[PDB]
Design a protein around this ligand. Sequence first.
Ligand SMILES: *Nc1ccc2c(C)cc(=O)oc2c1
Ligand SMILES: [Zn+2]
Lengths: 267, 4
Amino acid sequence: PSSSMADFRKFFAKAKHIVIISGAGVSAESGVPTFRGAGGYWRKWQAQDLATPLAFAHNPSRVWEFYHYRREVMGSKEPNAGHRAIAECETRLGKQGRRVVVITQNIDELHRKAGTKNLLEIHGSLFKTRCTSCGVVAENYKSPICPALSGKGAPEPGTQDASIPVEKLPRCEEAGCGGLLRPHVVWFGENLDPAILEEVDRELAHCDLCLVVGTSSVVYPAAMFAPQVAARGVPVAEFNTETTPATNRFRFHFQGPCGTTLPEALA
Amino acid sequence: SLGK
Ligand SMILES: *Nc1ccc2c(C)cc(=O)oc2c1
Ligand SMILES: [Zn+2]
């Protein structure tokens, strides 16, 4: 696959509908902990242990401590130059009547904080809740999300469970509900929102240029989306830190931090 | 617990 920035820029200059698939690497360049992969732990657990319906069923306080920590951590994190290049791209192209959409698995909203408006968050958001009784989804940026979680969620091994009674965990504020809230994030073993998948398909079907950023095109989630773009003859450009593009078929591979390559690519 |  080509590494010619000048050739990519020629496609970019003509593209009227860009899909940008954004993976964990974009968030990692902002220092956002993912609690996945080697070394990434919260206390003695990884996300595979806590981001599950079973974990929440048995230990909702521990799961809420985990997500509370991750919410509060965001107060010290900022979008990186990759987020900014992507947002600035959307803004500039939008004034020209050209579409940019970001499809991200990241749940930390740094794309939104950078100014991205056209955003499909396929794994949901740390800053949305869903009521386990009535289903309502709500924005929630409160620090702390409930009083009982103030000062909880410390990540250090040895930290004991807060063991907050479920009545004092975040509760639904719809009139006449009061049900127990969960984070509006996709957990292991769960379905994506079919409505989001429908929106994703529409974008993949109409785009004339696809970028895969901060992840590989041959693993989830990009592997679910990029192949059918490439099948239509649409160029796919990969921006990630792998030395070997674990793939041919795709037109471009640019190695490096997205905050180094994307400002130039999307200028 | 898996890969999403
Ligand atoms: N991890 C995961 C969960 C759910 C999925 C569906 C609904 C389809 C898909 O695209 O791949 C999935 C992956
Ligand atoms: Zn409710």
